[PDB]
Design a binder for this molecule. Structure first.
Ligand SMILES: Cc1cc2nc3c(=O)[nH]c(=O)nc-3n(C[C@H](O)[C@H](O)[C@H](O)COP(=O)(O)OP(=O)(O)OC[C@H]3O[C@@H](n4cnc5c(N)ncnc54)[C@H](O)[C@@H]3O)c2cc1C
Ligand SMILES: Cc1cc2nc3c(=O)[nH]c(=O)nc-3n(C[C@H](O)[C@H](O)[C@H](O)COP(=O)(O)OP(=O)(O)OC[C@H]3O[C@@H](n4cnc5c(N)ncnc54)[C@H](O)[C@@H]3O)c2cc1C
Ligand SMILES: NC(=O)c1ccc[n+]([C@@H]2O[C@H](COP(=O)([O-])OP(=O)(O)OC[C@H]3O[C@@H](n4cnc5c(N)ncnc54)[C@H](OP(=O)(O)O)[C@@H]3O)[C@@H](O)[C@H]2O)c1
Ligand SMILES: NC(=O)c1ccc[n+]([C@@H]2O[C@H](COP(=O)([O-])OP(=O)(O)OC[C@H]3O[C@@H](n4cnc5c(N)ncnc54)[C@H](OP(=O)(O)O)[C@@H]3O)[C@@H](O)[C@H]2O)c1
Lengths: 444, 442
């Protein structure tokens, strides 16, 4: 009899819609659910959008994915327990597919039934306050340029945290004559063919963007790190150096003495958790990390147990962790799972936060999120999936990347759901210039 | 004894701060004024910012100007009546200065007294409702990432309307192997040297972005128009063609059949009046036009006479029109100017809107905004300035542009404030690669 709002229809919002659909299909009555999505269609980050900055309605563009993007982790690590790769594709496919393939899989899971009709598209939530036991929500109908309002018993926030970029200033940028952009702006790497590219950062975006620039013909790619190099085996035309000091006209000067002519600077400097549409009292505030505090089981807002955040952690696991989070949130909403005492909640948060702060390397992090996700898995009825296999997969994958960053996407992993072994793709990733699902799924 | 909020510290916000300063210097008591500015410094669009999109705080970047930008109208048409070019610069200088020079002029006017201390920078107004005879305003202290709140008797919205881009989709963009950007994203034309540039639009941004790209070595520049070409005398390697149909790889295809190699598409397609920080009941909704309705004298919000908008009209006049609006707004706030009846307000709006809807060419438009500005001028005490001369200047300028779009900036105009005749700059604009204030001053 309650009414539930979901903000965002990407993997997380879809996860919980799907979780609810499971109950409805079994004949259980479920709450009225309204899902708000600022994009014109579902899929979240998995939708490619040529647009950058802000859209035709002045709404910031949430899309960060670029042309030629391929899965950067084993697809087997992100398989849906309730909708296997085998079921969706009707056959085994390689472990690292291009974006369109995974998008098709994501949307395939939810496109059979009534989920889509629950989503309001081109609709942007803009204000949220909790009053008299309800979330009062204002949202802009963008096409009509009109503010609407409604009231909900539960609010699920699933707006991700890789859309609003963090963009630091470096000396000399105000006089730089080339392009300065953030990875969030990166669209078609062909833009930089024949150009000298600087990328700043040391995580997945710096890694992949640098590779894409080289793959699509950049004259050179120079990666600057502040703390430690990524240290991967970069191919010719790429180097990694310590810390941009300044841009001096067309010249990038680093603290280790390196000087490099630069045509473009790409800041792969991460993203903000950004919730302008939430009251200060409801608003999660954190940097990107495996376990922000104030989130019971990493989902329930400590100070308001009817506000639930999905997907807000930094990510090794993704789709099936979102699922475990969503099933949990569903069950909290349905009063299947009961909230422990304030003291126990706080103690449990501190237990995980304390573990999280001591993590020293990717192996410990993988183990951490594995245990986090498995604990969630055990408190609801999300179907069988082998998180122990996924643990090993992630570790093997990390070793592949250090072995050879160019070929890790050529490796094969087994499904933690069906056991199916992924075949080796008909094209090595380092040579695969065509990123279409058609080219991928069909014979060479 | 009232309290006044101003949103924005560009030319318009500075205009009204300056207007209040004039009274304060004379010894008149003025209301407490708080000015909110999302940038870290004052100057509005006249500040160059390398940033695009949104800033380190996730706040959309309001800056739209690029490097090596030169003023595109005669400076004499935008001179401050209360702070002349001669006074600020101490000598006559050419009529079309680089951005920094006019920025220096704008900030010079307000730099001498206590105005800057009234401004909160890195502060973004986010919510506004009118309740119990007051504007309740929420603003983000961006550095601290904290929402703050205050209440004001009067609210002046001076946030411009050339910051939030209107960005239309064309077929083929989803697969175009090159950059697609809006003019709002344009920063340094050198980015596009040796490139085949497509520019879409038919107004000032299209015009200047096209010329800038050509000036800075674009391999070619092709301008698409939807309705009518600008029709200027474009140099070798530039053309205007009708209506983009689709991009097909590195190829722009127009409805008039032309196929053009395209490396970058620059949408010079205008901007939104965008006021997410205002309650629906307070929010001006309009396209870019010389006289939007619901604004008495183009300033006072018809449904709330304590809400005043500045600079929201499309613009031939700029600085001194903002001044005339600001002086008016100030006098309304100070209760020196009294609001006529609801029916007289409605009639007055209808009178101007009806004239505005009938304007058919730049000459009629220049005449219209001249009369709009002069009427404003006559109801407050903004100092003497020759709007009749300005009217003539604009028309002459329009003729220069049609005669030769490459040399209109090499022309001289006389000050409507002091009569000083501007020297012709020592370098024709086309070869003017040194846009430094130093080099411009002599
Ligand atoms: C460049 C890049 C590459 C990646 N590659 C991979 C990969 O290969 N494999 C992998 O497993 N993971 C990858 N990820 C991780 C990615 O975060 C997750 O796969 C997934 O997209 C997270 O889903 P989400 O629903 O939590 O957030 P999102 O996917 O960001 O979805 C959030 C949705 O909420 C909407 N929204 C936001 N604000 C509002 C509002 N105010 N009102 C209404 N709607 C709103 C947005 O439009 C968006 O659709 C990648 C991330 C990035 C940035
Ligand atoms: C590319 C370009 C070139 C131009 N060239 C010329 C020229 O050569 N000559 C000429 O006369 N005119 C020119 N103009 C016209 C220009 O509009 C005016 O010169 C002038 O900048 C308008 O001033 P304004 O104060 O009304 O708005 P702006 O200059 O835009 O100032 C608005 C200010 O409000 C701030 N703001 C916005 N939203 C918020 C918020 N929510 N909270 C707090 N602060 C906020 C912004 O940071 C900004 O500083 C040009 C415009 C553009 C876009
Ligand atoms: N191939 C793909 O499919 C693909 C491609 C791109 C992104 N992604 C996804 O995108 C998500 C986000 O990854 P991300 O790397 O964008 O964000 P991130 O993991 O949060 O990393 C942010 C990076 O920015 C650096 N940084 C922070 N401040 C800086 C400054 N002032 N100057 C220079 N560097 C600075 C940080 O390193 P220091 O603090 O040491 O400088 C850090 O390496 C990931 O989930 C990833 O899976 C996937
Ligand atoms: N040198 C300089 O100092 C300089 C340089 C650039 C800009 N500026 C300033 O910028 C300000 C604003 O000018 P502006 O031209 O950006 O905005 P504008 O004057 O509002 O013009 C918007 C243009 O976009 C076109 N347009 C609208 N929808 C379109 C679509 N779907 N596809 C293609 N075109 C479309 C319009 O023509 P159609 O509707 O006919 O297509 C119109 O020509 C001016 O005040 C000017 O002073 C100054």
């Amino acid at each position: 009899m309650s009414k539930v709002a979901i903000i965002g229809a990407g993997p997380c919002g879809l996860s919980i819609l799907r979780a609810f659909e499971h109950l409805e299909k079994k004949g259980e009555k479920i709450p009225e659910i309204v899902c708000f999505e600022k994009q014109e269609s579902w899929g979240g980050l998995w939708n490619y959008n040529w647009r950058t900055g802000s859209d035709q309605y002045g709404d910031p563009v949430p899309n960060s994915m670029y042309r030629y993007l391929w899965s950067n982790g084993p697809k087997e690590c992100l398989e849906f327990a309730d909708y296997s790769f085998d079921q969706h594709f009707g056959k085994s496919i390689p472990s690292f597919p291009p974006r369109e393939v995974l998008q098709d899989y994501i949307l395939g899971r939810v496109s059979k039934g009534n989920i889509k009709n629950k989503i309001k598209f081109n609709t942007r939530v803009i204000n949220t306050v909790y009053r008299n036991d309800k979330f009062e929500i204002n949202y802009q109908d963008k096409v009509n340029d009109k503010t609407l309002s409604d009231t909900f018993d539960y609010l699920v926030v699933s707006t991700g945290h890789f859309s609003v970029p963090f963009i630091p200033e470096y000396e000399g940028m105000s006089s730089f004559p080339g392009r300065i952009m953030h990875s969030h702006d990166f669209r078609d790497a062909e833009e930089f063919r024949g150009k000298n590219v600087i990328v700043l950062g040391s995580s997945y975006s710096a890694e992949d963007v640098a590779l894409q620039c080289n793959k699509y013909g950049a004259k050179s790619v120079t990666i600057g790190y502040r703390h430690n190099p990524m240290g991967f085996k970069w191919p010719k035309g790429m180097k990694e150096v310590h810390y941009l000091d300044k841009l001096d006209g067309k010249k990038a000067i680093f603290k280790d003495g390196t000087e490099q002519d630069a045509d473009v600077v790409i800041l792969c400097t991460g993203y903000l958790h950004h919730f302008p549409f939430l009251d200060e009292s409801l608003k999660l505030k954190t940097h990107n990390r495996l376990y922000p505090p104030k989130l019971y089981k990493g989902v329930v807002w400590q100070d308001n147990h009817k506000l639930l955040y999905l997907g807000m952690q930094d990510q090794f696991h993704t789709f099936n962790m979102f699922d475990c989070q969503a099933w949990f949130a569903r069950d909290v909403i349905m009063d299947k799972i009961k909230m422990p005492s304030d003291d126990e909640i706080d103690k449990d948060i501190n237990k995980w936060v304390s573990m999280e702060e001591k993590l020293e390397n990717p192996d410990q992090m993988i183990d951490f999120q594995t245990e986090y996700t498995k604990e969630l898995h055990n408190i609801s009825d999300y179907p069988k999936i082998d998180f122990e296999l996924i643990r090993k997969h992630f570790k093997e994958w990390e070793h592949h990347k250090v072995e050879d960053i160019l070929t890790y996407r050529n490796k094969s992993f087994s499904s933690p759901v069906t056991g199916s072994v992924a075949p080796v793709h008909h094209t090595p990733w380092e040579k695969a210039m065509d990123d279409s699902m058609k080219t991928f799924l069909n014979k060479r």
